Amino acid sequence: GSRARVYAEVNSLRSREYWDYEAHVPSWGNQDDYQLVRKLGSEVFEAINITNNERVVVKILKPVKKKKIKREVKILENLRGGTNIIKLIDTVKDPVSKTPALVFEYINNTDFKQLYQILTDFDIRFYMYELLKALDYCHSKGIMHRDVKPHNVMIDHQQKKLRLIDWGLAEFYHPAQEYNVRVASRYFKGPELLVDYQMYDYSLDMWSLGCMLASMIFRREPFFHGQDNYDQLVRIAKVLGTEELYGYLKKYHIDLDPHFNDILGQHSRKRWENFIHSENRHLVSPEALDLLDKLLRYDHQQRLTAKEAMEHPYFYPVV
Ligand SMILES: O=C(O)c1cccnc1
Known part of the structure; x- marks a missing residue:
């Protein structure tokens, strides 16, 4: 080919x-650390980290898609610090629904x-x-x-x-x-x-x-x-x-x-x-x-x- x-x-x-991202095991924090204030500018929200009052961006993922969540998380982690690549700050879950979300720099x-x-x-x-x-x-x-x-x-x-x-x-x-x-x-x-x-x-x-x-x-x-x-x-x-x-x-x-x-x-x-x-x-x-x-x-x-x-x-x- x-x-x-x-x-x-x-x-x-x-x-x-x-x-081998299918084998990756993300560490899921608590989304309760984040106050989701407004829609950013899709299922993406502007948020405030309640600890330090820093503005961030939270992207809510689709809970049932296990493979693609692991793939996106693994790739973002591999690229962390890369020039002009969006920085992943955290990986969290809403404690009630267990729905995974990604936290990004604003x-x-x-x-x-x-x-x-x-x-x-x-x-x-x-x-x-x-x-x-x-x-x-x-x-x-x-x-x-x-x-x-x-x-x-x-x-x-x-x-x-x-x-x-x-x-x-x-x-x-x-x-x-x-x-x-x-x-x-x-x-x-x-x-x-x-x-x-x-x-x-x-x-x-x-x-x-x-x-x-x-x-x-x-x-x-x-x-x-x-x-x-x-x-x-x-x-x-x-x-x-x-x-x-x-x-x-x-x-x-x-x-x-x-x-x-x-x-x-x-x-x-x-x-x-x-x-x-x-x-x-x-x-x-x-x-x-x-x-x-x-x-x-x-x-x-x-x-x-x-x-x-x-x-x-x-x-x-x-x-
Ligand atoms: O990676 C994303 O989808 C993303 C990151 C920051 C802002 N909006 C979307």
């Missing part, structure tokens, strides 16, 4: 305890729908670079996020702080492992997911990041706007090209779902310059498009790693 180009073996250098977020409209060229370079630091970090620890999207990138624009959140879909990368392709959120799903290729890796997060970069510099949010998972691939092919899609599938011996036969159509590859017009011209540059082209490409294995992306000339002003 395929393997990752950069942190392929990191989990083989770990003790089984590190990645970040005063600006909704991306408003924030992205005032970002400058420099701002986009700055925050993308910060997000790349988080991805390079978690990839280096053998973990794929699998849900990179604007809602999961909290930004405090006052303090210039960025935190990558919601590790509920994150998984450990093991070479040749076959994963669930029904992950991420529709607009940010990589083509490997949409064609049911299960042997994917960290490069999935780099596709999602590319989708974010495209929506920020082009002001088309989301950039690939599929109406369903099938149409999502069609939207991508209208840009990257249909013959190019087939080349990708041939290289990895992927059979295309026959449903695509009559909806895919025929589309030549578009040059990224095609998406420039007066409303986004001040966010676009040749270096932006060169980076983008090396992220949003079918071949997951040839996509830039997070570290390679960080070395790109697009980030020279923020390095």
Whole structure:
């Protein structure tokens, strides 16, 4: 099949305890230590630690999902202290219902729908670079996020702080492992997911990041706007090209779902310059498009790693 180009073996250098999350036994404190005051900005609340009066964020989990709770807790613990990764403060249970919850550092977020409209060229370079630091970090620890999207990138624009959140879909990368392709959120799903290729890796997060970069510099949010998972691939092919899609599938011996036969159509590859017009011209540059082209490409294995992306000339002003 395929393997990752950069942190392929990191989990083989770990003790089984590190990645065997089904065996992890969280220590559950008492949620009564927390006063849940308001909804944050889903089942996430602003809270006050009653002991020290510190503001935190409490995320209530779904009690019946044992595997995923252990997986999210283990991954968050493995990543603790990672650059721009949301800090898990505590793991607690409500003493009556026994429902598990996670306690996180508080970040005063600006909704991306408003924030992205005032970002400058420099701002986009700055925050993308910060997000790349988080991805390079978690990839280096053998973990794929699998849900990179604007809602999961909290930004405090006052303090210039960025935190990558919601590790509920994150998984450990093991070479040749076959994963669930029904992950991420529709607009940010990589083509490997949409064609049911299960042997994917960290490069999935780099596709999602590319989708974010495209929506920020082009002001088309989301950039690939599929109406369903099938149409999502069609939207991508209208840009990257249909013959190019087939080349990708041939290289990895992927059979295309026959449903695509009559909806895919025929589309030549578009040059990224095609998406420039007066409303986004001040966010676009040749270096932006060169980076983008090396992220949003079918071949997951040839996509830039997070570290390679960080070395790109697009980030020279923020390095
Ligand atoms: O990890 C999460 O889901 C999270 C963390 C802080 C704030 N909102 C969500």
